[PDB]
Design a protein around this ligand. Sequence first.
Ligand SMILES: [Mg+2]
Ligand SMILES: [Mg+2]
Ligand SMILES: [Mg+2]
Ligand SMILES: [Mg+2]
Ligand SMILES: [Mg+2]
Ligand SMILES: [Mg+2]
Ligand SMILES: [Mg+2]
Ligand SMILES: [Mg+2]
Ligand SMILES: [Mg+2]
Ligand SMILES: [Mg+2]
Ligand SMILES: [Mg+2]
Ligand SMILES: [Mg+2]
Lengths: 394, 107, 131, 63
Amino acid sequence: SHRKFSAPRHGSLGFLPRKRSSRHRGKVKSFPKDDPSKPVHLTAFLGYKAGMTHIVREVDRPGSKVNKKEVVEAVTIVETPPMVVVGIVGYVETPRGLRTFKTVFAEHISDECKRRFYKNWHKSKKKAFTKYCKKWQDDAGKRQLDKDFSSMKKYCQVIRVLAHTQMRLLPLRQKKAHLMEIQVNGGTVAEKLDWARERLEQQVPVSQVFGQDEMIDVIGVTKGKGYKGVTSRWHTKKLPRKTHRGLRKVACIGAWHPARVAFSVARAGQKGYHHRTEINKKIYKIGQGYLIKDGKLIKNNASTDYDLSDKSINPLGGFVHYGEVTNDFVMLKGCVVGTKKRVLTLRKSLLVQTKRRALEKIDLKFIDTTSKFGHGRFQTVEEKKAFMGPLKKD
Amino acid sequence: NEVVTREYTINIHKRIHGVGFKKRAPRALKEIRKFAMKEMGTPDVRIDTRLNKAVWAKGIRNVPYRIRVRLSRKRNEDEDSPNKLYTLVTYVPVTTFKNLQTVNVDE
Amino acid sequence: SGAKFRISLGLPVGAVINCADNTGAKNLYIISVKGIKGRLNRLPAAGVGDMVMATVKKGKPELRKKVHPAVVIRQRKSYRRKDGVFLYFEDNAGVIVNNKGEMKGSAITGPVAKECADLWPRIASNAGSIA
Amino acid sequence: MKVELCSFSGYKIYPGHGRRYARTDGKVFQFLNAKCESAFLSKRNPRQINWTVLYRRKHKKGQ
RNA sequence: UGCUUCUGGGUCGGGGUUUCGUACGUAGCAGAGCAGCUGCUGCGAUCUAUUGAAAGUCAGCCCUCGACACAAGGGUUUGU
RNA sequence: CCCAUAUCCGCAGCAGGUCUCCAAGGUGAACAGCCUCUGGCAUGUUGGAACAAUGUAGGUAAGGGAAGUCGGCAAGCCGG
Ligand SMILES: [Mg+2]
Ligand SMILES: [Mg+2]
Ligand SMILES: [Mg+2]
Ligand SMILES: [Mg+2]
Ligand SMILES: [Mg+2]
Ligand SMILES: [Mg+2]
Ligand SMILES: [Mg+2]
Ligand SMILES: [Mg+2]
Ligand SMILES: [Mg+2]
Ligand SMILES: [Mg+2]
Ligand SMILES: [Mg+2]
Ligand SMILES: [Mg+2]
């Protein structure tokens, strides 16, 4: 018989199966559709979730209750040291879909990238690309590369660059770089290859990919949470306290007929560590990394037009469980998937951004840099010392 | 230099963090014995009964946070024993733990 | 024009709040909330600035035994504002009104939340202070 | 945005920190954290709490 | 994820951050009083100074490159 | 000699049953509960490593306060 009172089902069947992701680094499932009339540009990037904070800005929203007024907004800090292009991969459109046509690699590949090619770097002899790299040094090999580059011009329709991160500049334990294809959108196929060929072994800073006030998508793997029951995995109603044999369950997992449990019924199992794509996360700031100019370390990348204090984005005591952000970073509005240190794929939007929220221009008045390791109450150590005064340590 | 002696401070606090009350002191001994093997590489580790008394001096759950020990690698006089050497872990009473380094002891 | 923002709801159905006007009612017993569509098993809830349907449990005999439209003006449950401020009051209060939003009384005791003052001009003009 | 001061401890509260309290008598207070709020609501006098600005001023600790 | 680029991670130490709230001892003509001796000496909860002191703080916090040792290894497989 | 969480009866070294005598200090009204001495024991027919779900047994919870449910069942408030 029909269920007495209507109610929406718990959870979305569009995110099934609720299993551990097969990839740790978020995969770009769909790159932006190429527009041949735009200049050659890259469409994605890799960053690492440093941590969260909040900022003060004045909203510019005509007809809104917060028009001309200051608001406090949470933001996620993603460290984005420049990537290094090391290879090109070309694709051919076939009636069975894009097929990898040809891959070319640069002559020199840093050991961070090579670590990606091994399961035990300690035990290996580091022989990767030791014989390929010779193709760039002899006339017979060189004449074979430009033919490979010429073939990719005749036949390939999609061009991507194999860029990798620079793990030596991060505060992390890992030394193995994250390597990913990035589609080269823009001009003709020939213009894509000349642009990509010129940038082999070169560095591509995040600013060259993304801009201020741009809406982007973050792709990553959520925080794993292990085996979970239906109450926590699916958010079903807890049964009454009197229930015998447990109340953190779904009471009826199906009807007599069909004589099977259906795929649409909440069950226990893995929670978290799911691949997810989130869209429309606005870029609030592309902060510049530390520079040594005239013997001085310039690090006031957390200063604003309305706050001239020389402080970095790092909070007192550093980003908890992450470290210190000393490279370029992207300040995203809101929260993103993953743990601290999680590698996050930054991708340009697949949509046309014509909305007041999407077009709004961000102007920061303040960036909170108090300690997150507790209830921090000082923005800077200079401010803390001036308030507290001398201590017994002094 | 098989026969060597060094003085260590063992941060028991971080070794037994999260352990249940009735298992806290027993696991301090297990971590002290695990620590000695790492630093001296001798599966035959002998813990002085005075060090055992120091780890239990406050009960099963309120174990001391830090403890200053001394490790001496000695030759096993037991020719039958498969281990030529063994480590002896003794107790060093200290008033303070501040600025105490790993120190070579010369006998 | 400018529309109010979501705030934490502290007063489910069944909450008895003070009556902060001079009608005669001493407290207001919330029996429902305006605008609540709701879902299975979820109680309708109210926050500062929300009109509700209430009964007087303690007060003048004429005000009891009937349903009045009331408006919440203070709540003990802290709610975030767009400036990041988490505000809460010492007690939950409300005032009786009519469907048009005009106060059945003429004076209010205690402060009134800015959320409610903006939404109800007739209540605002009677508020001694705005929090 | 301007910076308030904790009504109990005298520390300054930056935007997005602590809570604001409005009493039925019309007085409004700000608190840096639940520790300061807890002391204020249990009717503790800040002049006897060693780590407050009122205490150190009273005992001339900084001076 | 790491396992020798005079380099690496580790341990301890130090520094930062942070929590609680001002340590033991010592001094006090601060202390309601009381006792003994001719102002002094004792008992006395608590109070003030030393003293935002002491204590803890990664075990899944941040930075050290100070001390100490360790690190160039071991086993089983895999061929067009 | 055992006289009972192992010498007795329950098929057994069975959380059951089975008649008595002596009876320390502290707190306290107290043969209450809590700690200790004399005397006794080794955690109740196993250990090690983990700290997922669901349990069993204990706790805590903002705002509301029975709206839950057949029913305030359960817990909670009160307590000398
Ligand atoms: Mg129906
Ligand atoms: Mg039952
Ligand atoms: Mg925190
Ligand atoms: Mg229901
Ligand atoms: Mg037991
Ligand atoms: Mg046993
Ligand atoms: Mg037995
Ligand atoms: Mg509650
Ligand atoms: Mg409460
Ligand atoms: Mg009912
Ligand atoms: Mg019902
Ligand atoms: Mg009952």
